[PDB]
């Protein structure tokens, strides 16, 4: 089997991407944030504290003839941005782009933090990291991908995120029309539960490539590109007037600037992030200070190849017995 679904930016900045997901019988369609940096499929629901729901579409398990309470199971997650959610668990039928999993753990939120409430466009998350990170207790649950894997034509999914445009998540096949040139595959460590890999270096604009190993994670659920302070300083030094602002929370730059591109290495291959992808717009409405899309990972504890990086590539998440990651230009 295979599945193919369109993923759509939630706003004009590509702050996140939502993908429609069918849950239950009859189907209830919710727009979920597919997150290769976590491993829980959780939704706003009829059980979510009413004051914490503000415009989201909710899952109502009592209206699904295939829903079953997973008795005694609870979940609780905290994300790198400080947001969180928790609740109880149902199993139900879940379909993405025509690919159906029966008995999927659907984690129903009783509580969500303010950032979730305030984002009316995201109805929940669909985790695509390794199932070892799943938070359900006392019986850990599998991701949608892990449940689907054996039925897939090939044990893979691909992320093809758009810049200020829709893109695609495919399951079970590699669309050879969706990228240019060849796909370069690189080793993955699953030791921390992430799609963790090592970039071979970087370049800023038309500058020379610096060969240096940068360990980090491919994370579709993180907006920006978080890299070591040395790398990030080298980038922003090429933008007149750019500076790190502790009050704003990262590098800002004059909105009048033209940003240079940023290249990252994948083995001997190179992925080029155009300068425009690194512009996250005014820090507040009407400001002439703009927020940068490349930020320091110092104090995160890990480097993150988030959407800024991934949307410059066609990305293969290869879930074979020994997982790997592939990157192609597009």
DSSP string computed for 78-120: E-TTS-EEEEEEEEEEEEETTEEEEEEEEEEEEEE-HHHHH-T
Chosen domain end from 174, 200, 222: 174
Domain match, 225 and 325 both: yes
Domain match, 137 and 195 both: no
Strand partners, 251: 244
**Residue 125 to residues 31, 202, 249, 292, Cα–Cα distance (Å):** 9, 31, 25, 25
Name, in order, each residue with C-beta under 8 angstroms of 323's C-beta and a sequence gap of 6 or more: 188, 190, 195, 317
Pairing between β-strand 124-127 and β-strand 28-35 as defined by DSSP bridges: parallel
Name, in order, each residue with C-beta under 8 angstroms of 325's C-beta and a sequence gap of 6 or more: 185, 186, 188, 195, 197, 218, 315, 316, 317, 318
Radius of gyration of the chain (CA): 20
Longest dimension (CA), the chain: 60
Active-site residues, by number, are 35, 199
Domain match, 90 and 183 both: no
Tell which phi-psi region holds residue 252, choosing left (phi > 0), alpha (psi between -120 and 50) or beta.
beta
Domain match, 190 and 134 both: no
This structure's resolution (Å) is 1.2
Domain match, 31 and 115 both: yes
d(CA 245, CA 283): 11
Strand partners, 79: none
Pairing between β-strand 41-43 and β-strand 99-112 as defined by DSSP bridges: parallel
10 Å CB burial of residue 77 (0-12, 13-18, 19+) is buried
Structure determined via = X-ray
Domain match, 150 and 17 both: yes
Domain match, 230 and 103 both: no
Q: What is the DSSP string of 157-224?
A: EEEE--SSS-EEEEES---TTSSSS-PEEEE-B-TTSS-EEEEEEEEETTSPPEEEEEEEEE-TT--S
Chosen domain end from 142, 174, 206: 174
Domain match, 46 and 134 both: yes
**Residue 258 to residues 157, 289, 319, Cα–Cα distance (Å):** 35, 13, 39
Q: How many domains does the chain have?
A: 2
**Residue 44 to residues 47, 50, 80, 138, 292, Cα–Cα distance (Å):** 8, 10, 20, 22, 31
Q: Cβ distance 253 to 290 under 8 Å?
A: yes
Name, in order, each residue with C-beta under 8 angstroms of 120's C-beta and a sequence gap of 6 or more: 54, 55, 56
- ∠ Cα 106 111 116 (to 5°): 85
Chosen domain end from 148, 174, 200: 174
Domain match, 292 and 153 both: no
Q: Is 301 helix (H, G, I), strand (E, B) or coil?
A: coil
The first and second tokens of residue 241, run together, are 């007037």
Strand partners, 108: 43, 88
Quote the domain boundaries for residue 203. Answer: 175-330
Looking up residue 151, the CATH number of its domain turns out to be: 2.40.70.10
10 Å CB burial of residue 76 (0-12, 13-18, 19+) is middle
Domain match, 128 and 212 both: no
Q: Cβ distance 267 to 184 under 8 Å?
A: yes
What is the CA 149 to chain-centroid distance, rounded? Answer: 19
Domain match, 12 and 161 both: yes
Name, in order, each residue with C-beta under 8 angstroms of 268's C-beta and a sequence gap of 6 or more: 184, 200
């Amino acid at each position: 089997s295979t599945g193919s679904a369109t993923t759509t930016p939630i706003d004009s900045l590509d702050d996140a991407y939502i993908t429609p997901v069918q849950i239950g019988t009859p189907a209830q369609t919710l727009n979920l944030d597919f997150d290769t940096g976590s491993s829980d499929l959780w939704v706003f629901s009829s059980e979510t504290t009413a004051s914490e729901v503000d415009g989201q579409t909710i899952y109502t398990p009592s209206k699904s003839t295939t829903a079953k309470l997973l008795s005694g199971a609870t979940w609780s997650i905290s994300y790198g941005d400080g947001s969180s959610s928790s609740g109880d668990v149902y199993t139900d039928t879940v379909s993405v782009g025509g690919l159906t999993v029966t008995g999927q753990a659907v984690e129903s939120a009783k509580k969500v933090s303010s950032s979730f409430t305030e984002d009316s466009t995201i109805d929940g998350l669909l985790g695509l990291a390794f199932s070892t990170l799943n938070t359900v207790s006392p019986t850990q649950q599998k991701t949608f991908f892990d449940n689907a894997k054996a039925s897939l034509d090939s044990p893979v999914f691909t992320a093809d995120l758009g810049y200020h445009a829709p893109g695609t998540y495919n399951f079970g096949f590699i669309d050879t029309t969706a990228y240019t040139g060849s796909i370069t595959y690189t080793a993955v460590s699953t030791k921390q539960g992430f799609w963790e890999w090592t970039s071979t270096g970087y370049a800023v604009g038309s500058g020379t490539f610096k060969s240096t190993s940068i360990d980090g994670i491919a994370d579709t659920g993180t907006t920006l590109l978080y890299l070591p302070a040395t790398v990030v300083s080298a980038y922003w030094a090429q933008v007149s007037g750019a500076k790190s602002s502790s009050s704003v929370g990262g590098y800002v730059f004059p909105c009048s600037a033209t940003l240079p591109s940023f290249t990252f290495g994948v083995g001997s291959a190179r992925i080029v992030i155009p300068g425009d992808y690194i512009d996250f717009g005014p820090i507040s409405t009407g400001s002439s200070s703009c927020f940068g899309g490349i930020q320091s990972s110092a104090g995160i504890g890990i480097n993150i190849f988030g959407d800024v990086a991934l949307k410059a590539a066609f990305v293969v998440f290869n879930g074979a017995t020994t997982p790997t990651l592939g990157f192609a230009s597009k």
